[PDB]
């Protein structure tokens, strides 16, 4: 991830390496190579609960008004990276000694709008497996930490908590609509703090395996389960599926900036990626391993 | 004694003297007198009982049984069940299908009574049933000896007072048949018994003290002194004696508290809630261990308790419909919630304007700002609203919906409509007090004070918050005029006490100029 | 300003409660709802002298926010304050649902519920 830092000419960037380590480094004129700004080593036996194997990877996210940085070190650390040298202490907020139990994460994004870094967290407290949905029919959930950085502590406003069990990646929706999208296998939710859940279902493998009060898109039959996304400049964002199926998904807006429905449309076929990126207005990149990974051009149509 | 029912409803003296003259009246006039009972106390079986004895005197065979399929699921008294068992055994005795039954009658007597302490003889009298019923040959013979054990190991597992004499007959059972194999038979379920025989002399100490015979009352000394003797037994369950992790044989029992604490106190709100909220507790607790199709099972019973309060005993008391909204939320039957909320608008004579305000705080919360509006054009057609949801969904654009001037209509809307209630004005008065702008509230103040929609009399407060609002902005010239303006509008109560009427001019929230001694003699009051 | 008295005076509940109503008013939630976990967490005020601070907590979340969120803090408010308020649940229900004198019950049945009325 990447930040601007304050009074800095370019953009450090937080890179994170196995076990839990960080390194904010930037590009230097004069060596034209790097420059290390900062090292961050958290790979103490404490932090991790006895886990040995560790499966879940460090994750760096920013906030957008540049204020802090999170890294999830080993699925349940939150360590907090303040910002303005031009930085300032760490600390590692405990996850599984917050409210609600968070326990088991599957994404968290920085979420756009606010007066302090608010960070959305999905979560699975009570967890399953597609595969065993009859006794155990929809576990993941919400949690909006809001991080306080002088004072340290961090109220868990907004949390929802039957959303289908079959969640994967978070996405933090920008500032003029604000909220989230949650990705789910057969579904896709826009949820936000003032407004109901909506959200639709992608194919009738929903009937038996979710509670969650989901419509019908019609004339859509797809499922995202590993499906990266980006987003246009506000309502229009970018889902490529698996199968390398580009989807441009409009969130439709009321008059209060509200989504009321959604729009798809089944834009052309590329790479399978594991990435994408938004470059100058009207360039995609779709980072993949298995695949030429491409700079795509959309326009409009008339 | 129907001029004592006037003054007291639920006067129990004046009650005792109609039924002591029931029986010096025939069944035709008597029962008028006894369906103005048990309509009135639904809960209280002892006086079920007595209508019952009353009809089963002159012969009424065909009456009595629609009393039972009337108060026998709705009162769990152990002499209304014993009374039930008694009547089968006398009308029924004669016909040739009377031990298929008489034998089904105790088991669903067991099932929902059985658990009380005074059930040992509704115990004894299906040993003896089943001894009675004929049987030939040696596998129906054997057929007996099964059905009599069966009852026999469930009984010895239940407190209750007799429990070492069930034993005792067990004993000789076993003996009785083969005294070889007694010797296993009573070893191997010795152990349990030992549990079952400690508890229930454990269950005897907080059941000695209470009534269990009081009618149904709210509460108006020794009536809260009997409330915590209820709330012992509630408590000293969910205290789980029988220590253990099945939640199932745990709130089953506090459930049998339960349905005992609402035959004595089913006025009591209290009880209701604390009812549900347990099952609510257990819902949630057995969906975590595995148990799932269980977890539905008491969620939807208590939506029946619930259900119970606000359809037989407390239909006009608010709490307990709110509290099964709320329920209903959480379980997210949105669609069930609007129907619980029509169900208390059409009660005549209570004060919609409560409920408007949580029925419009269901609809922003669960279903968006267009449907609240449509909630608060339903109390606006209402003529028994009264001022304050008028002030809450203004409340609940500005601080949900992040909007002014939506703010700003609605309260407008009220004020030409109630501006002679002084209740209302100071929720708008404040209101606009916080939104900062200077030429905003002072703007407010001057329609209020001038337009004559409020009395001037009741305007006390109004002219209270103007002086906190003119000493945090505004000039010592602008006070000046007011102070001299509001002692002229209350020249006849403020005459003597000018002085201390400065203090608020100058106080803050506890900061007064002068000693609460001093202030005792000046005159001073605090609103 | 404020925050400089409540690094100073974070012990005085009279104090918090003219600052909780300042912010309860400045129509912003997110904000709101901060400072309430502040001064509920932190340590800073003792927790025995701060049950007029979770009165003014449901009054905020009964006007924004969900069901969801209330009925996490009527079981945290009650583990906080366990000793008290054990057998008072349902007069402590109403203020979950009162406004300025509205009640859902009458005053002569709140007598015996145990409500009290700060």
């Known amino acids: ?302 | 004694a129907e001029k004592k029912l006037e003054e007291n409803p639920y006067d129990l003296d004046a009650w005792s003297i109609l039924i002591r003259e029931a029986q010096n009246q025939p069944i035709d006039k008597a029962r008028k007198t006894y369906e103005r009972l048990v309509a009135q106390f639904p809960s209280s079986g002892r006086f079920w009982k007595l209508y019952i004895e009353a009809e089963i005197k002159a012969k009424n065979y065909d009456k009595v049984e629609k009393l039972f399929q009337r108060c026998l699921m709705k009162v769990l008294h152990i002499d209304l069940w014993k009374c039930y068992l008694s009547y089968v055994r006398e009308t029924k005795g004669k016909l040739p299908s009377y031990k298929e039954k008489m034998a089904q009658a105790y088991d669903f007597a067991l099932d929902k009574i059985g658990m009380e302490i005074m059930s040992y003889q509704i115990w004894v009298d299906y040993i003896n049933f089943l001894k009675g019923v004929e049987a030939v040959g040696s596998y129906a013979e054997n057929q007996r000896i099964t059905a009599v054990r069966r009852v026999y190991q469930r009984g010895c597992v239940n407190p209750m007072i007799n429990i070492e004499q069930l034993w005792r007959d067990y004993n000789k059972y076993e003996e009785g048949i083969n005294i070889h194999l007694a010797k296993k038979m009573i070893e191997d379920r010795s152990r349990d018994y030992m549990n079952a025989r400690r508890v229930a002399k454990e269950y005897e100490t907080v059941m000695k003290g209470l009534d269990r015979n009081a009618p149904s009352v709210p509460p108006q000394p020794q009536e809260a002194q009997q409330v915590d003797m209820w709330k012992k037994y509630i408590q000293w369950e969910k205290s789980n004696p029988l220590r253990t992790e099945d939640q199932t044989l745990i709130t089953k029992r506090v459930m049998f508290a339960y349905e005992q604490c609402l035959l004595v106190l089913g006025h009591h709100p209290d009880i209701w809630y604390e009812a549900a909220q347990y099952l609510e507790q257990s819902s949630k607790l057995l969906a975590e261990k595995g148990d799932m199709n269980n977890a539905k099972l008491f969620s939807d019973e208590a939506a029946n308790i619930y259900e119970r309060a606000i359809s037989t005993l407390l239909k006009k008391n608010m709490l307990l419909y709110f509290a099964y909204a709320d329920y209903e939320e959480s379980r997210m039957k949105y669609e069930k919630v609007h129907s619980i909320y029509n169900r208390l608008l059409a009660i005549e004579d209570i004060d919609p304007t409560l409920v408007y305000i949580q029925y419009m705080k269901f609809a922003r919360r669960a279903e968006g700002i267009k449907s609240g509006r449509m909630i608060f054009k339903k109390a606006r057609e209402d003529t028994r609203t009264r001022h304050h949801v008028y002030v809450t969904a203004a409340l609940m654009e500005y601080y949900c919906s992040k909007d002014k001037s939506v703010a700003f209509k609605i309260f407008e809307l009220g004020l030409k409509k109630y501006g002679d209630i002084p209740e209302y004005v100071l929720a708008y008065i404040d209101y606009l007090s916080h939104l900062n702008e200077d030429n905003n509230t002072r703007v407010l103040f001057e329609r209020v004070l001038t337009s004559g929609s409020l009395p001037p009399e009741k305007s006390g407060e109004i002219w209270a918050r103007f002086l906190a609002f003119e000493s945090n902005i505004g000039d010592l010239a602008s006070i000046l005029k007011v102070e001299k303006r509001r002692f002229t509008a209350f020249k006849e109560e403020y005459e003597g006490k000018e002085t201390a009427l400065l203090v608020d001019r100058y106080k803050f929230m506890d900061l007064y100029p002068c000693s609460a001694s001093e202030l005792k003699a000046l005159g001073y009051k605090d609103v």
């Open chain 1, 1 to 302: 991830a990447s930040v601007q830092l304050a009074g800095a000419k370019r953009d450090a960037l937080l890179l994170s390496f196995k076990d839990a380590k960080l390194s904010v480094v930037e590009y230097d004129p004069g060596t034209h190579d790097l420059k290390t700004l900062s090292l961050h080593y958290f790979e103490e036996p404490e932090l991790r609960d006895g886990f040995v194997q560790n499966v879940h990877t460090p994750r760096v996210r920013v906030d957008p008004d540049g204020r802090c940085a999170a890294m999830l070190v080993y699925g349940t650390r939150l360590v907090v990276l303040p910002f303005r040298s031009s930085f300032l202490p760490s600390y590692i907020i405990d996850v599984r000694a917050l409210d609600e139990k968070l326990l088991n994460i599957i994404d968290l994004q920085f979420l756009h709008g606010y007066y302090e870094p608010t960070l959305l967290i999905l979560f699975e407290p009570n967890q399953t497996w597609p595969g065993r949905v009859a006794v155990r029919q929809d576990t993941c959930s919400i949690v909006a930490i809001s991080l306080n950085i002088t004072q340290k502590v961090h109220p868990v406003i907004w949390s929802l908590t039957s959303l289908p069990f079959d969640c994967t990646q978070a996405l933090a929706v920008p500032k003029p609509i604000g909220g989230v999208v949650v990705f789910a296998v057969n579904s896709l939710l826009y949820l936000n703090q003032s407004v109901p859940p909506y959200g639709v279902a992608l194919n009738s493998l929903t009937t038996g395996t979710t509670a969650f009060p989901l419509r019908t898109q019609e004339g859509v039959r797809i499922t995202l389960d590993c499906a990266q996304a980006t987003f246009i400049s506000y309502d229009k964002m970018v889902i490529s599926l698996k199968g390398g199926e580009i989807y441009v998904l409009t969130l439709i807006t009321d008059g209060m900036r509200s989504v009321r429905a959604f729009h798809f449309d089944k834009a052309a076929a590329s790479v399978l990626t594991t990435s994408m990126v938004t470059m100058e207005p009207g360039y995609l990149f779709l980072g993949s391993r298995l695949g030429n990974s491409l700079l795509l051009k959309y326009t409009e149509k008339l």
